[PDB]
Design a protein around this ligand. Structure first.
Ligand SMILES: Nc1nc2c(ncn2[C@@H]2O[C@H](COP(=O)(O)OP(=O)(O)OP(=O)(O)O)[C@@H](O)[C@H]2O)c(=O)[nH]1
Lengths: 157, 373
């Protein structure tokens, strides 16, 4: 999107007030001396699918981290390798999820996640969109949907 | 988990999947026009016969093609149509003269020689991988007072049995147009609930043994019993919020409305009570009559038990695992592949929204495109 550059990256408080307008939340803390936002809740993809718990951590200058905490995802993965995963976190357990093409792979300079957009509009429908392709990875053995480029050498990190 | 303790949204979503499978698996109207022009061509080739028994021969349809309850069979590319030719000058004649007359009248045409295989209820003009045509020669019955259609048919055993197709069909076409009462929520219905019970019957025969493969229930004794169960629901004037409890209550009254009287099972016609549609049920050589009363009720138990297995599944991968065993492997894959070519089109068009309180994505607040990597 051709947008103006007058809008700046916005602080903790504006997405602190924005997360309470949508959905049921268990707790929403602020830790590490007014640095790190934390959200967890119950997210369901469809009417007949499972029950999921996601976890959102944000710091300025860093991309946000989505990680599914319950269930463990490796027992229902069936001990085969799950693609579209980042290297995992050392502080909270679970499988980390990918949601965006970052800044270094884009050509216009604007990433798929931007700092102008708030948190609850985009990344939790993208987490539900990751989970809606996660259980249709099963019953066919393929990842039908969005896919990455077949890069010969690049690690995307 | 039972299918009556579910909410209405999951129940009518299951019934929408069943009606989507039946609307896939039926016969389309362009093929109906080709079948209609084809059998009217067979009827005009009968009407130019030089034999006097063949004169004034007219063909009207019968079976499932009159009631719009035709379903593509299991492992079969080709449908089946059945017809009756009525001959008023063959009332004096015997069945061998009319069988040789219809056989010579389709022996005159050479494409009807190269497209023919015989069958005991009548001659079958099968085609190359599209459909079949059947016919049945019949007289008229004289000396009885009826609301409609007095007729005998040709049977291979007793040489003239009886039927009454069009009054029974107009009894179905008068009961089918009546819609029941619906509560206030804060192709007809009887034509569709016959058809999903026929589709459940083919995948029921994929697991049963070879003695129950002969003893699977025949399709016209399922047709007349749900017509009996639909007349009682209209006469009771009850109301229904859902469209799956019109399938479950009709299957519940399905064993109570088959009436055995003086030791012989009678599922008759309302217009002509002489001939028995459950005469196949009634014969007791090698205890076969108890075998088709046992194997109808085993299918009656397993068409309620598998409706609790769809309600017991969690996960969308296990919804299509359970519905694979209801419809076969192939037709659930067409409905599933349509469901995320609509969902991949919803990301580009922006129609996909997500309410945060319910949590679930709804595909008809726009999500950005190209989310994965
Ligand atoms: N026994 C018997 N069954 C009938 C008669 N008329 C229609 N049917 C049944 O109608 C049922 C369902 O309709 P279809 O499956 O379309 O019938 P069909 O496959 O076209 O039957 P055919 O053309 O004879 O092969 C079948 O099970 C037939 O046996 C009849 O006069 N006697």
């Amino acid at each position: 999107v051709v947008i103006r550059h007058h809008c700046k990256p916005l602080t903790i408080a504006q997405q602190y007030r924005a997360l309470k307008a949508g959905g049921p939340y268990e707790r929403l803390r602020i830790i590490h001396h007014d640095r790190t936002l934390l959200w967890e809740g119950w997210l369901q993809p469809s009417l007949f699918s499972r029950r999921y718990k996601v976890a959102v951590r944000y710091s300025l200058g860093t991309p946000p981290i989505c990680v599914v905490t319950e269930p463990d995802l490796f027992a229902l993965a069936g001990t085969r390798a799950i693609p579209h995963l980042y290297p995992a976190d050392k502080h909270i357990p679970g499988a980390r999820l990918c949601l965006f093409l970052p800044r270094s792979q884009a050509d216009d300079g604007l990433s798929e996640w931007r700092a102008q957009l708030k948190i609850s509009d985009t990344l939790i429908p993208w987490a539900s969109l990751w989970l809606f392709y996660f259980e249709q990875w099963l019953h066919t053995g393929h990842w039908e949907g969005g896919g990455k480029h077949p890069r010969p050498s690049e690690v995307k990190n | 988990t039972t299918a009556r303790n579910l909410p209405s949204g999951k129940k009518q979503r299951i019934a929408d999947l069943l009606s989507q499978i039946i609307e896939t698996l039926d016969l389309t109207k362009t093929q109906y026009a080709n079948i209609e022009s084809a059998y009217n061509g067979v009827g005009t080739f009968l009407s130019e016969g030089d034999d006097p028994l063949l004169q004034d021969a007219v063909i009207y349809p019968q079976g499932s093609v009159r009631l719009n309850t035709t379903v593509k069979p299991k492992n079969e590319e080709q449908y089946d149509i059945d017809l009756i030719c009525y001959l008023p000058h063959a009332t004096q004649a015997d069945y061998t003269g009319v069988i040789s007359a219809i056989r010579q009248r389709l022996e005159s045409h050479k494409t009807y020689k190269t497209l023919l295989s015989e069958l005991p209820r009548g001659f079958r003009i099968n085609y190359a991988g599209d459909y079949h045509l059947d016919i049945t020669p019949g007289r008229d019955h004289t000396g009885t007072a009826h609301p409609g259609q007095p007729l005998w048919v040709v049977d291979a055993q007793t040489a003239w049995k009886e039927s009454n197709p069009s009054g029974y069909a107009e009894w179905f076409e008068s009961s089918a147009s009546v819609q029941p009462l619906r509560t206030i929520l804060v192709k007809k219905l009887l034509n569709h609930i016959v058809q999903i019970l026929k589709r459940h019957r083919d995948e029921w025969a994929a697991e049963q043994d070879e003695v129950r493969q002969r003893c699977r229930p025949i399709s016209v004794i399922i047709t007349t019993l749900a017509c009996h169960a639909y007349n009682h629901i209209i006469a009771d004037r009850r109301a229904y919020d859902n469209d799956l409890d019109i399938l479950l209550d009709v299957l519940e009254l399905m064993p109570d409305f088959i009436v055995s009287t003086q030791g012989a099972i009678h599922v008759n016609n309302p217009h002509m009570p002489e001939e028995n549609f459950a005469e196949k049920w009634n014969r007791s050589e090698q205890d076969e009559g108890p075998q088709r009363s046992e194997a109808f009720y085993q299918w009656h138990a397993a068409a309620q038990a598998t409706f609790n297995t769809i309600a017991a599944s969690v996960g969308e991968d296990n919804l299509f695992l359970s519905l694979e065993d209801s419809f076969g492997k192939t037709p659930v894959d067409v409905v599933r592949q349509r469901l995320m070519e609509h969902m991949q089109s919803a990301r580009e068009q922006g129609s996909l929204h997500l309410d945060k309180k319910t949590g679930g994505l709804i595909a008809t607040a726009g999500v950005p495109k190209n989310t994965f990597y």
